[model samples]
Target chain A: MLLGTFNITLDAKNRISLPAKLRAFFEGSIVINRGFENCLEVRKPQDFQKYFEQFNSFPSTQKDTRTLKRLIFANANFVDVDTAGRVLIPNNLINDAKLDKEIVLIGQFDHLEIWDKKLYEDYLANSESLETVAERM
Target chain B: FQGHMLLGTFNITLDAKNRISLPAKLRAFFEGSIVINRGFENCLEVRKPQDFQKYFEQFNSFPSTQKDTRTLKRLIFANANFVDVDTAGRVLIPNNLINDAKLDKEIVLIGQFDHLEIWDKKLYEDYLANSESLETVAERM
Candidate 1:
């Protein structure tokens, strides 16, 4: 039930304090990694490990699998929340995701995806309508 | 949230053999058994048997024609493993899963509503460096 579309910030220290509701859902350690599109994916530590396992399960012989692994794991970083409930993402991820001080955090049920504000808005504007996507579902 | 049911965080150590003894309270919470799966993040997820069944059903309900459905099944079901707490209340972790989480002797277990998350110590600490403010994010929500 990780549900919500949140607008958050990246401080000078590269930290993003999670939303209060979400913070309660994630205690202890979490994992941050490269996400599809220009964003970052954050998950519970063990959940990230599971993702890595899936990446490994894919046949390495396949180009897609190798590329997927390199894309996701090469930049992944493990993190923990502070007493104040903030977590730091890698500088490279911030740069790669083109995140400014303001960013968007969308709860995708299983995990949270962080996106650049403008990019996310543009994504919504350019993508197929949810109505169309829902039809497929 | 969940009113202390699946709440609170605990720090514990994995023995040399990768076995961790559940705290008496958590052991009681789990009722001596659980299912472990690779989580979406780099850690591991532990769920009650009935909970895992519900989770499995959600995946099952997805139409096979959906492009990533099969891949999701492969990613999830393939790595799902079961563990039973021993008399000593310890569960042996699989080597591959341990490596996947980059675990060391110290680990953290977090109650995440429906399931539990196990994390490596240092990695979890480093992760806190990047978080934003909860109040601000909530306002936008």
Candidate 2:
């Protein structure tokens, strides 16, 4: 699971070295794609295969499949890990995720997610502020 | 936190060649090797290269590595292939291996913690539907 908030930055080459422990976790190959909440999601090939099975079930006309296939599959990329255990974010992905320099790697379980640090901070700040209205009632 | 169940159900059909598109969201985890083995509890095991390395270490520790273990060794070692999860997130399953698991057009993949189990869709639903009950599910864990 990719959790917590670690500050990271993309290098000049558009590549970022994953944190050591994570690099080891993803030691072989990775698939990168647009993630919800304005971040990038990464997963191993087998893991990706397993995860994709869910979306494959939906009919193309279904709401979930329509948005998902169009938004995610259309924008996804397979990133081969380099010798140094780093993955280069494609120029478009970087822009889509709005990753300029500083970023955040949060554990999302079964995958690691990359987020723009400042935006994540803001969302984190506001996301936890509300109590459940139904529960309160 | 989103917890582990980040995805919902998807229906997929395996092409005639036994290839399935790797989900884009899941492309990050594999970096080196993928282990394709017959899982004892049914379905197929898709484990990380490192995970298999460590699993083999414990497995080799058993006395079966001797003549008594030849069968186990042959199956585990000979049948296993260390295939790279390509950048396209697609790993082709050989014909024989696919037959071993009875994988057809419809396959289901559900997460089980560290690894994913690949199952034939009809078999998966049959197993799950038979095993789980709504009454039990309604209660909090």
Candidate 3:
């Protein structure tokens, strides 16, 4: 289970070394897909298909489904983890997420989400309050 | 394959009874219990109970008022079934799902991240030949 929030960096090769703790949890292919609010979500190749199935399950007759399909699938990439536990983030994904030198990685149980540090902070600031969260739940 | 999730493609055959023995690598994780459902494409999906529960939660969380919610739910849960893999490592495929995937004697079991996808051998090969190439899909990724 991917969990916790950690700070990381993007290197010259546009690669980032996964935290050691998380490294052991993933292997082979990793999927880098666009997440809500200009962040990138990293998932095991296996976990990524669930999203694919869910999106495609939506009726093709609906404009909303097509819009969602274009937004998600068109922005997804399959990445391989090198022996050193580093993954190369696609240039487009990097630009979309507004990732620069400093980044934040948050564990979302089944996957990990990468964010531009400042953007993540801003998101946290704008997030609903505990009362709102409880009420919504 | 990566971590504990079922990963990789395997060539499998259904017995005369239309039952398949799980791949040795896959049996370890799915030996106890599993859920099978109709897949988006012409295929079937098999997921462990815990994973299926989580997937169902997401499926159920979609607001009922959405235009496509009912269709999506039927495409998902309506055909879903839960069963335990027998000690012999075999699982039965319901005829309806078998027909949905157009399955025959020979089939392929692909390890999807969260589940296993079962497809008729000929159709899977055809799919590989005729479907959108991964390169085309990855163009903008």
Candidate 4:
């Protein structure tokens, strides 16, 4: 039942507070990893493995599949949470997203993602007419 | 974990002070416990602990010595956060992560088939504009 869009920012400690409602869905622990786009993906460890098992089915010989494999496997990361409901972001990822002070976090089904404020706006504008993609259906 | 796409757009602004509110519905997703970590592409990731670990085992197969393989491992593990959702269903985004994504106002969220994505609205549009290059790439999908 993961649904809807959220607006969030990074805090002073560099941690983005998660929503209390969604936190309940997590139970005690969760997993964070690399996402396909220029964002990060979050999920439960078991769900991650289940999804990846399907990902593993991609043919090794296919060029695109290989690239995707690289994207999925190479960029994955695991983050543990703290009591205050904040996770410290790494410097490398910060640089990648070009985050400075302002930031945003969104809940995607199966997982969530972090985004650079300006970069996300650009993505939306460019995608103004993309709702018709068959893949979207 | 349920399998589906969650969709929406949120408005944000970072003024002299740096803080943003979580969307009401969005907050509901993180209502319970949450796991935050560094992920690929320089963005942060959030998930349920059980679901997060499941994704990790699959990613663990990647070789670290190859290229930037260590990127996810080092960053995510080193800067991970665990938190619980408040009654308001809101959680704070870490400062380091905020700096990492450079998020301010106008952020966009895209629903991937399995997971969701957060993007810098303007930058994401730029990437989307360039997505035409992926048509040939998607042909492979």
Candidate 5:
């Protein structure tokens, strides 16, 4: 039940440390990847592997399947959290996602998204209003 | 029989494959189908369709536009599963659900007013240990 908006920092060490509240939900190693819309995603290894398996379950020859795989699977990074609970973000995800010193972590149950604060602010500003998305859903 | 009020409590052992024998008392109301959802704070909620539908309606009444509502909505719906009792009177829990609740080999399945709650025996005992006294809870209620 990952459920909160946390403002954290990308430390000088280049690691993102979760607050105690969110940290309680995770332990050991987790996977990080470039999620859709330029946001980075963090998911448990089992869940990450589970969904990845489903992604490849489709016909490999299908163009749609290939595109989906290349989009998400190509840059999946499996990393461990250092004892102090910091996970070093690799350069590719950092530069490509426009990550900065100030980071925004949003919990989404199965996984969470790590966003650049400014980028996330702009995302919400440009996204369809929650009400509209709710009604349609 | 699981009447209007579900009242039985049992300590059952989970099989190596994450299966539990459905107590005979619970079997009557199941009618070959059951709904299991991730309950709050490491517990599993089991309900018959007739009862679970009522919960589903109430859960949806809240606007998903609210962050809390959507979080809870996704939490409940995505993790829920429709399971069946095997001929041998067993229900195999889904791996994620099993992992989510952190259930151990021995679990306590207890009935509340309209649902059955499954908890790891150790966690159940710890929960009871940390909870307010029944008398205190009633007074507060």
Candidate 6:
């Protein structure tokens, strides 16, 4: 299981030194994709397809499903973990999540969300609390 | 994966580093694997993977066209974590969650009907203090 907020850095080469604790979870590589918010999501490559496979249950031609697919699959990128556990972020994703030198990677259990530190703090400041949301549900 | 009753409360401490030495009895209740998700009342939900997934799968029916649906998607799926009983018995709780519920050194893990809820010790105490009497609350049912 992947957990914890990993304070990593995006070096000049646009690579982030993933934490060894998280790195130990994978044997070969990691998959990166745009998050629902302004962040990037990481997962073990083999575990990537389970979501899409479930999506297959519905018609791909369905507009909503199509949009979801395009947003996720069209932007997904896979890269190998280098000798020192750093992986280069594609230019597009760096733009997608607005990455900078200092990065914050929050563990979402099943996957990881890499956020620009400032952006992440901003997000936490304004996001809705589960408390209010639960009041109605 | 076996027939079980997830009852009882466990008081544990989150180390200075924000890790929980998950209780052995709680870890065994689910047969090793568990999913911790953002839950109501500013608490965390510890559930079996099957239960968590089944609850999350309800989102599948929510149309993507609605803004609310997208928000709900992010609320649960992105906020949940899956883990197994670890070699060192540590539970990994993200920093956001730590602050989300204002968890401090003392933590309370309470069993509900289906899953366990992790509450800040003080918060749970306050909740219990303010709650209506069980006999009165149960009368409506």
Q: Which candidate has the top score in DockQ?
A: 6
Lowest lDDT sum, 10 consecutive residues, model 3 chain A, at A59-68
Per-residue lDDT of candidate 2, residues A1-137 (tens digit): 55555678877798888887788778566777777777888887667767666654444323333334434544555677899888998876899789988888887779988888888888787764356645565
**Model 3: CA > 4 A from native:** A1-137, B1-3
DockQ of each: 0.03, 0.03, 0.04, 0.06, 0.03, 0.18
**CA error at residue A91 for candidate 6, angstroms:** 0.7
Q: In model 5, which regions exceed 4 Å deviation? A: A1-137, B1-4
Docking class of 5: incorrect
lDDT of 3 by residue, A73-114 (tens): 545667899999999999879998898989899999999999
Global lDDT of model 3: 0.77
TM-score of predicted chain B versus true chain B for each candidate: 0.86, 0.72, 0.90, 0.70, 0.92, 0.81
**Candidate 4 segments exceeding 4 Å error:** A134-137, B1-139
Per-residue lDDT over A83-105 for candidate 4, one digit per residue giving the tens place of the 0 to 100 score? 76666665545655666666666
lDDT of 6 by residue, B1-141 (tens): 333667788999988878787677666667566787777777988888777766655655665334455444556655666666567777777786788778988999987757888889999899899989999999977
DockQ of 4: 0.06
Name the runs in model 6 displaced over 4 angstroms. Answer: A134-137, B1-6, B9-39, B42-109, B113-122, B133-141
Q: Candidate 2 chain A, which ten residues in sequence have the lowest lDDT sum?
A: A58-67
Candidate 2: list runs displaced more than 4 Å. A129-137, B1-141
What TM-scores do the predictions have? Answer: 0.51, 0.47, 0.52, 0.47, 0.51, 0.68
Residues forming the 10-long window of minimal summed lDDT in candidate 6 chain B? B63-72
Q: Each model's RMSD to truth, in Å?
A: 18.6, 13.7, 10.4, 16.4, 14.6, 5.0
Cα deviation at A60, candidate 2, in Å, is 2.6
**For model 5, how does the per-residue alpha-carbon lDDT over B1-89 read when each residue is reduced to its tens digit?**
33556777888999889999988777765667777877866888888867877877675456432555554554465466668888888
lDDT of 1 by residue, B1-141 (tens): 233367678899988989888866677667667777667556888888778878876864575325455335434544556678789989888776798678888998888778888889876776655556788768987
How accurate locally is residue A102 in candidate 4, as Cα lDDT from 0 to 100?
Answer: 60
Give residue A120's lDDT in candidate 4 (0 to 100).
75
- Deviation in Å, model 4, residue A102 alpha carbon: 2.7
Q: Count the backbone clashes (under 3 Å) in each candidate.
A: 33, 27, 1, 87, 0, 1
